[PDB]
Amino acid sequence: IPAELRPGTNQFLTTDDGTAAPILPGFTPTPTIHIPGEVHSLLELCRVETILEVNNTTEATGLTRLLIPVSSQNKADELCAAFMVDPGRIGPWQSTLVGQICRYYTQWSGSLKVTFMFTGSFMATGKMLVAYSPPGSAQPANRETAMLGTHVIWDFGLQSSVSLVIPWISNAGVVTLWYQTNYVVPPETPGEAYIIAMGAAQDNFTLKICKDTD
Amino acid sequence: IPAELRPGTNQFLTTDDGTAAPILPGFTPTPTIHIPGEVHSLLELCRVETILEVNNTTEATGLTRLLIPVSSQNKADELCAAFMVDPGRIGPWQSTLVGQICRYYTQWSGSLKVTFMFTGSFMATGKMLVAYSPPGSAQPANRETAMLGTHVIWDFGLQSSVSLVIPWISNAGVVTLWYQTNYVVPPETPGEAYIIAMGAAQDNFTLKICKDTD
Amino acid sequence: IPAELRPGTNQFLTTDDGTAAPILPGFTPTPTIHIPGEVHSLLELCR
Amino acid sequence: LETTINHFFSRSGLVGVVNLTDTGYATWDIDIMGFVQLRRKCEMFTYMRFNAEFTFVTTTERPYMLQYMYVPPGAPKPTGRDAFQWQTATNPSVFVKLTDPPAQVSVPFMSPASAYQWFYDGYPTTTYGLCPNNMMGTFAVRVVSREASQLKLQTRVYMKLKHVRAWVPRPIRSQPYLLKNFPNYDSITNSARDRSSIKQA
Amino acid sequence: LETTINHFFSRSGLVGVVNLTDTGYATWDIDIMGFVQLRRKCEMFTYMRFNAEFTFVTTTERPYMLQYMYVPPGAPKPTGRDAFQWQTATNPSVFVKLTDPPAQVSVPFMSPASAYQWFYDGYPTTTYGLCPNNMMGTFAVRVVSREASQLKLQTRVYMKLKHVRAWVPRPIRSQPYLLKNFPNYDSITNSARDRSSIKQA
Amino acid sequence: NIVLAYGEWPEYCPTRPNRFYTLDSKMWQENSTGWYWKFPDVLNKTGVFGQNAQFHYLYRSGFCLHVQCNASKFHQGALLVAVIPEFVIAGRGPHPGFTTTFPGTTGATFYDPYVLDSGVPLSQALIYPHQWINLRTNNCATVIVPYINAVPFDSAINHSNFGLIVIPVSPLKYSSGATTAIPITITIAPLNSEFGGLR
Amino acid sequence: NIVLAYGEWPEYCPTRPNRFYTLDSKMWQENSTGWYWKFPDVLNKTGVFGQNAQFHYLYRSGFCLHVQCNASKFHQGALLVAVIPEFVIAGRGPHPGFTTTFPGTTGATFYDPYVLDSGVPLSQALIYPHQWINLRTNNCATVIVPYINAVPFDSAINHSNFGLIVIPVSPLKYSSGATTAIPITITIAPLNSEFGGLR
C-alpha cells in the first residue's frame, strides 16, 4: 500500500500517548488488594482544614507562630490580627495545604473558608468581630467602619468555633478581627488565651495550567 | 495516506512479537503424530518425587550420600538428621528436580512436601519423630522441645513410608527427625539400615520472573 | 496516525509476495483461447 | 479534568544523566529519587503503583550499534564490557543505531508487594528503613564494536509514569535534606516568610 | 502464566559469532548446541518441534550491498566468493544494506521425521548417535562488490524459537562436558556442595 | 464523636484469637513537648497478646483507641491526637538508633515538634485522622484504626504499622495553687486480630 | 500396582504376528553396581521373534515387563527399575564401542552409577516410569511400555527404542550364614507387534 510521511514524525514530544513495547511480555504483575484510603484526585486533599500560620513575625520562633494572642488588657476596638486572603502569595497561607498545592497549577479560582477556634478556660467570656472586606479597598480603621461589611459577631461563652465563607477569589481581600468588648476573667484564672486559625477550600475550587513549584 | 514515525521504530527489541517473512513460502511441513508423553508446561515436572541428597558430608563419595544412616546403638532422643527446607539455597535441595528448575524463576512460592521411606529388614521395629519448626527460630535441642511442634510419630512395624506437608514458604524452616526409641533387632539380623528421603511440590507452587541459571 | 518500523523492512527477500506497481496501467492483455493439453502440475508428467 | 492523579504524574521529565568514555561501558541504577522536583511529588503519598516507560537520548560531544541491556531485579550486573553477562538471553536488550530517532521501552510493575512503599518502619530481620522490595534494576549502556570505540558519548534518560494509583497521603517536605535516602534535616528553617507585625496586612 | 513451555523458550539469545575479513566470505552451520545456556535447556527433552527466526547484527570495526544466502539441507555450500553457487535461484538470499536496521528472516521446520531428536541410539546403517535428520543448513555471509571489499566486518546471529512443542522429559546435565556433540565426561564432580556434618542445619 | 480512620470497620479475609489495656499515664507540665508510641510494638511483652505476638511471625489486627485526659475547669490548653501510618523518625544532625525508635510502653518524647522529627511541618498534620482535645469542650478522644499495609501480613516485632502522636499545641497555663501536672491515660483494644504460624 | 509408561495401552494404527520370554537371572552380591539391557535388542537371535526381527526391516511393538527378585525375610536393600527412552551410553575419558552398547541377553554392567554413565545424576532419575522394589514390602515390579518414537517405524537391529535399568541404591546387607547372592529374573512379552517387509 502507498503511504507518505508528514512532517513531525522523527521527534520526541515529551508529552506523548503512544505506548512503547513492553520489555517483559507475558509477565503478570502481582494483583492489588483493598488498601483503605485511596485518593483518586488531589482535589480531595485541598478540602482538609489545616492549621494556618498567622503570627509570622520575627520573634516567633517555634510553635508560638501557630497562634494569635488574646490579651486581657486591650481596650475595646483595637485590631487583634489581620492577614490577606491570598492562597499562594508569600505570607500566612504558605504553611497550609492549600498554599502548597497552589504553587503548582498557575491559575486558581474558588471559594475559600476560614475557621477559628478558641483555647481559653471554661470560665472566660468575651466577643470578637470577625470582619472582611472586598479586594477593592484596604483594611478598615475603626470598629465602626469595619462593622458595615460582612461581620460575624462571635462570642466565647456559647460557641468555641466559627467559620466564614469568602466568596469568589481569583488570581486580594483582607480579613481582620476586632475585640468589640473587654476580655472578662474571674479571679484565680490566667488571663491569656490564644486563637488558632484554620483554612480550607469548598467545592467550586478549581485549578488550571500545571507549573513546577518553589 | 499520511503517517508519522513515532520514536522507537528502528530498533531490535530482543523480545518481540512481529513475525518475519518466511524464507520458504508454500512449504508444508511434515505433519505430527501422537507421540505419548507430551509436556505442556514445566509445572508438571516439579511435581515428581525425586531423591534428595541429605548425607552431603565430605567423606560421602558416591551413592552413599543418597541415604541417611540409622544405627542400632544410638541412645534415645539424639538427632538422626537435619536439613533446611530451602528450594534453591546451596545444600540438600540442590540435587532434586525442584532445586534445578528454581535456579531459574527468581521468585518462588508454594507448599513443598517431604517423603521418607525405610530400607531395613522385615523383622526390624522402631519409631521416628519427624519434627518441623517455622522459620522464626533455629532447630530444637531436646526431644521435648521438638515434640511441641508439628511432629508425626512414624514407626516401622506398620508403615514403610510417611509424608509431611510444609505450609507456605517464600523467597528458612528446619526439619529434623529424632529417634524417640531404641532400634530393635532379633538375633542373626544386620542391625543397620538407611532412610532415603524424597522431595516434591504440591499444586499451589508458583513461579515468577525468569533468570538464567548457575 | 502513528506508526513504527520494525526491523526487516529495507531488504530484498528473493522470495516475496508483494506486487510491484505495473509499468503499463490500463493495458489489457490479449485474451487466451483453448489450447489443448494444459498442464496444471508437474505430477502428471511423472506418471 | 486535569487535577486527577493520573494527569499529575503524566509528564516525562529528566531522571539521570549518564556518560561513558570509550572503562568502556556505563551502568545506572533505576531510582526516581534523583531530583528534588520528583521527590517532593512522590513523598506526597505512602503507597503507589505504576508502570513506567523510558527514552534514551544520545548526544555525541557515524552511527554505531550501541545497545541498552536491562537487568531484572536479582540478576548480576556486568563488570566489564567483554564479560559474559552481555550475552545472557534472560536480560532483554535493545540494539539502536545512533542516527536513528531515540529508543523507547516500557517496564512493567516488578515489586513482590501489591504497591511500592516509600516509607518503611522496621528492619530486614543502618538497616533502618531500607525496604529491599523497591529494586527495579539497571541499564548498562554499552557501545558495540570489536575494539577501540573512541566516541566520548553522553546519554540522557527520561521517564514517564503511567496508570498510577495512589493511597494514603502524607504532608509535604518543608526543609532541605542532606542524605539521599533518609529524611535527616540537621536542626532549622521556617515555612512562611516573615512580615513586620501581626497587624498591617 | 509464564511457566508454559512456549514462554520458556521465547527469548532471542545469541548463538554464533561470525566475522569475515574482506578469503572474502564467511559461512556458518546452523546448530543450537553452541552455548551452554541453550544446551542445558534443550537436553531437557527428547523430542522437540519448533519454527525459528533469525536476526543478523553487523558491527564494522558507507553502506554496502552485503547478502545473506540460505542453504536448504542437501544443497552444496559455496567454496569461493565468486563461485557459481551464489546465483542459484533455489537458494533464498537476502540483500540488506549496512546502515539499515538489521535483517530478520524466518525458517520453517525442515526435518524428515515428525520432530527433532536430541538423542539417537543406533547407527546410520564413530557413527554412534549421529542422526543425519538434524541438518538445517548454512548462511554464507558475503559482501557484494565487483572487487576489493576491504571492510573487516563482524556479524552476530540471534535466534528466537516459536510454536515449540516438547515431548518426553529427561533429567538435566550435572557435569561439564568435553566434546561438542557427545556426553563424554572424563571420570567426577558432585551435585550439592558439602557442609560440616549430617547434623547442624 | 468517634473518628473512623478512612472509614473501614476492620474485618478480615491462621487462627482468630479483647481486654481493655491501659498504658501508664504521662504527666503534662508547662514545658512539655509531646509523645509518641508506634503501635503494635507497645503491646509486646504485655499480656496474652504479648504471648501471641512474640511467638507468632504473621500478623493482622485492628485497634480501637481512647485517649482521655482529666482536667479541672481552671486549666486551659489543647492537644492533638493524630494517627500516622508508617511514621518514621528521621534523626537529626547520624541515624537515631534503636531505643529511640522503639520506645516500648514508656512512649518516647519529641525534640522538635514543629517539624515532627521528620522534616514534615505540623501545619499540615491534619491530613491524618485527627481529633482535637480542647480543654473547654471535652476530655476524651476515640480513634478506630484498621490494618493499613501493602502486604496482607507482617511480623509483629519488626514492622510497625502506624504511630500515635500527642502534641501540646497551645501550652498549659494555670493560676497559682492548682496542680502542676495533668495526666493523660490511653486505652488500647485489639478489634479483629488474626495470627498465623507458631515458632 | 502396575505402572503404565505415560498412560497409553499400546494399540496400532505390514502383517500383525506372545510367549513369555525369560532372561537369565543375574546374581546380586554386596559389591554389585547395576545392569542395563537396551530393548528391543535382547530379543534378537532368540525365539520366533528373533526370526521375525532379523529378516524384517520395519518394526513397531510394545512390551510388558515383570522384574521379580526372590529374597527371604533376613535380607535388606532396595532396587530401582526405570525405563529410559533413547538411553545413550556416553563413554568415559574415547567412544565406548559396540560390545558395550549392545550387550545382548547378558545385560552389561555399570561403571559409575551415580551419573548413569551419561552425565545425568541419579537423584532425578524418577522422571522416567519408575517402581521401587523395596525388599520389606514386595518382590515384584511390572512396567508396560508403548512404542515411543518420532518416525512411526524403524529397523529392529540398529535403533534401540528404550532401555531398562536396575540399580541397587541401598546395598545388600546380610547376617552370616545366609546365602550371598540374590537372583533377579525378568519376563518380556511383546504386546502388539507389527512387522513389515521381508528381506
One-character DSSP codes across D133-200: GG------EE---SS-----EEEEEEEEEEEEEEESB-PPP-S--SSSSS--------SS---S-SS-
Task: Give the up-direction half-sphere exposure of residue E93: CA atoms within 13 A in the CB hemisphere.
Answer: 18
Task: Provide the sign of the torsion angle of the four alpha carbons B40, B44, B48, B53, taken in this order.
Answer: positive
Distance in angstroms (rounded) separating the CA atoms of residues G25 and G30 = 16
CATH of the domain at E32: 2.60.120.20
Given CB atoms, is B17 within the 8 Å cutoff of chain A? yes
Strand-pairing partners, residue A82, are: A176
H helix and E strand count, chain G: 1, 15
Given CB atoms, is C18 within the 8 Å cutoff of chain B? no
Opening angle at CA G117, ends G111 and G120, nearest 5: 140
Distance in angstroms (rounded) separating the CA atoms of residues C32 and D106 = 57
Distance in angstroms (rounded) separating the CA atoms of residues D41 and D19 = 27
Distance in angstroms (rounded) separating the CA atoms of residues E70 and E61 = 25
CA dist B144 → B81, B149, B174, B181 (Å): 17, 10, 16, 13
Distance in angstroms (rounded) separating the CA atoms of residues F48 and F62 = 16
Nearest to G82 by CA among G173, G31, G145, G9: G145
Distance in angstroms (rounded) separating the CA atoms of residues A185 and A192 = 9
CB contact under 8 A, G92 and E185: yes
Distance in angstroms (rounded) separating the CA atoms of residues F71 and E10 = 72
**Overall size of chain E counted in residues:** 201
User: Other C-beta atoms within 10 Å of C25: how many?
Assistant: 6
Given CB atoms, is D148 within the 8 Å cutoff of chain E? yes
> B150 vs chain F: nearest CA distance in angstroms?
10
Distance in angstroms (rounded) separating the CA atoms of residues G146 and G5 = 7
* Main-chain phi, psi angles of C19, to 5 degrees: -75, 145
Nearest to A116 by CA among F134, D103, B188, F199: F134
Q: Which numeric CATH code is attached to G1-199?
A: 2.60.120.20
Distance in angstroms (rounded) separating the CA atoms of residues D109 and A47 = 32
Extract the C-alpha cell encoding A164.
466564614
Strand-pairing partners, residue B140, are: none
Residue type, A212: D
A43: containing domain: 1-214
Distance in angstroms (rounded) separating the CA atoms of residues G57 and G159 = 11
Cβ atoms of residues F39 and F160 within 8 Å: yes
Distance in angstroms (rounded) separating the CA atoms of residues E83 and E76 = 11
Nearest CA in chain C to E57: C7
Distance in angstroms (rounded) separating the CA atoms of residues A175 and A153 = 14
Q: Which residues contact A44 (CB under 8 A, 6 or more apart)?
A: none
* Main-chain phi, psi angles of F51, to 5 degrees: -80, -5
CB burial of D32-55 (b: ≥16 within 10 Å; e: otherwise) equals: bebeeebbbbbbbbbbbbbbbbbb
Q: Which residues contact A38 (CB under 8 A, 6 or more apart)?
A: D165, D166, D167
DSSP state of F74: T
Extract the C-alpha cell encoding E87.
546465483
**Three-class SS of residue B163?**
strand
> F19 vs chain B: nearest CA distance in angstroms?
27
Task: Give the up-direction half-sphere exposure of residue G91: CA atoms within 13 A in the CB hemisphere.
Answer: 16
Distance in angstroms (rounded) separating the CA atoms of residues E94 and E75 = 17
The DSSP element (H or E) to which B99 belongs, if any, is helix B97-101
**Three-class SS of residue B174?**
strand
Distance in angstroms (rounded) separating the CA atoms of residues B163 and A8 = 68
Strand-pairing partners, residue G174, are: G75
**Three-class SS of residue G149?**
coil
| Helices assigned H by DSSP within chain F | 47-53
**Overall size of chain F counted in residues:** 199
Within 8 A of C1 by CB-CB distance, chain B residues are 1-4
Chains near F (3 or more Cβ pairs under 8 Å): A, B, D
The beta-carbon neighbor of B25 closest among C6, C8, C15 is: C15
Within 8 A of G5 by CB-CB distance, chain B residues are 36-37
> A5 vs chain E: nearest CA distance in angstroms?
18
DSSP state of F176: B
Nearest to B8 by CA among C2, A7, D144: C2
Residue type, B198: M
Distance in angstroms (rounded) separating the CA atoms of residues D65 and E154 = 12
Extract the C-alpha cell encoding F78.
489543647
Given CB atoms, is B206 within the 8 Å cutoff of chain D? no
Residue type, G172: L
Cβ atoms of residues A200 and F124 within 8 Å: no
H helix and E strand count, chain B: 2, 12
Distance in angstroms (rounded) separating the CA atoms of residues D31 and D46 = 16
Nearest to D104 by CA among F26, B111, E108, A13: A13
Give the CA radius of gyration of chain D. 21
The DSSP element (H or E) to which D38 belongs, if any, is helix D36-39
Cβ-based burial of D156 (10 A; exposed 0-12, middle 13-18, buried ≥19): middle
Strand-pairing partners, residue F183, are: F27
Q: Give the N- to C-terminal CA distance of chain A in Å, as an integer.
A: 53
Task: Give the up-direction half-sphere exposure of residue E185: CA atoms within 13 A in the CB hemisphere.
Answer: 21
Task: Give the up-direction half-sphere exposure of residue D171: CA atoms within 13 A in the CB hemisphere.
Answer: 29
Give the CA radius of gyration of chain A. 25
Given CB atoms, is C16 within the 8 Å cutoff of chain E? no
Distance in angstroms (rounded) separating the CA atoms of residues G122 and G137 = 23
Cβ atoms of residues G49 and G190 within 8 Å: yes
For chain G, the domains span 1-199
Q: In chain G, helix, strand, coil percent, each to 5?
A: 10, 30, 60
Cβ-based burial of B114 (10 A; exposed 0-12, middle 13-18, buried ≥19): buried
The DSSP element (H or E) to which B130 belongs, if any, is strand B127-133
**Strands B174-178 and B38-39, bridge-based pairing:** unpaired
CB contact under 8 A, B20 and E105: yes
Residue type, B156: F
Q: Which residues contact B205 (CB under 8 A, 6 or more apart)?
A: B43, B46, B47, B108, B109, B110, B111, B112
Given CB atoms, is D132 within the 8 Å cutoff of chain E? no
Cβ atoms of residues A170 and A111 within 8 Å: no
Distance in angstroms (rounded) separating the CA atoms of residues E183 and E178 = 8
Q: Specify the number of domains making up chain D.
A: 1
CB contact under 8 A, B211 and D74: yes
Nearest to G10 by CA among G191, G198, G149: G191
Task: Provide the sign of the torsion angle of the four alpha carbons E7, E12, E13, E18, taken in this order.
Answer: positive
**Strands B68-70 and A206-207, bridge-based pairing:** unpaired
The DSSP element (H or E) to which B196 belongs, if any, is strand B193-197
Nearest to C2 by CA among D145, D34, B9, B22: B9
DSSP state of D102: P
User: Other C-beta atoms within 10 Å of A16: how many?
Assistant: 18
The DSSP element (H or E) to which E1 belongs, if any, is none
Distance in angstroms (rounded) separating the CA atoms of residues E63 and E60 = 10
Query: Maximum CA pair distance of chain F?
Result: 57
Q: Give the N- to C-terminal CA distance of chain C in Å, as an integer.
A: 56
Chains B, F in contact, 3 or more Cβ pairs below 8 Å: yes
Q: Give the N- to C-terminal CA distance of chain F in Å, as an integer.
A: 41
DSSP state of G170: E
Strand-pairing partners, residue F82, are: F165
- The string of DSSP codes covering D46-86 is SEEEEEEEEEEEEEE------EE----BTBPPP-STTSGGG
Extract the C-alpha cell encoding F147.
490494618
Strand-pairing partners, residue F3, are: F143
Distance in angstroms (rounded) separating the CA atoms of residues D34 and D37 = 9
Distance in angstroms (rounded) separating the CA atoms of residues D138 and D31 = 9
D111: containing domain: 1-201
Nearest to B64 by CA among B169, B191, B174, B196: B196
Cβ atoms of residues G162 and G6 within 8 Å: no
Cβ atoms of residues B51 and G122 within 8 Å: yes
Nearest to D118 by CA among D38, D193, D43: D43
Q: Specify the number of domains making up chain B.
A: 1
Distance in angstroms (rounded) separating the CA atoms of residues B118 and G134 = 9
Q: Which residues contact F81 (CB under 8 A, 6 or more apart)?
A: F67, F130, F131, F132, F133, F141, F143, F164, F165, F166
Nearest to E104 by CA among F83, F32, B22: B22
**Three-class SS of residue F144?**
strand
DSSP state of F90: -
Give the CA radius of gyration of chain E. 21
Place of cell 493511597: D167
Nearest to D92 by CA among E18, B212, E98, E162: B212
Cβ atoms of residues E171 and G121 within 8 Å: yes
Task: Give the up-direction half-sphere exposure of residue D61: CA atoms within 13 A in the CB hemisphere.
Answer: 3
Distance in angstroms (rounded) separating the CA atoms of residues D197 and A167 = 27
Expressed in Å, this structure's resolution amounts to 4.0
Distance in angstroms (rounded) separating the CA atoms of residues G127 and G123 = 10
Residues 127-146 of A with CB under 8 A from F: none
Extract the C-alpha cell encoding B102.
528454581
Q: Which segments of E61-177 are extended strands (E)?
A: 67-68, 94-95, 103-107, 116-117, 141-142, 153-167
DSSP state of G59: B
Place of cell 518394526: G59
Chains A, G in contact, 3 or more Cβ pairs below 8 Å: no
- The structure was resolved experimentally with cryo-EM
**Three-class SS of residue A161?**
strand
Extract the C-alpha cell encoding F113.
515538634
Given CB atoms, is A159 within the 8 Å cutoff of chain F? no
**Three-class SS of residue G52?**
helix
Cβ atoms of residues F113 and F80 within 8 Å: no
CB contact under 8 A, E196 and B57: yes
Strand-pairing partners, residue F84, are: F163
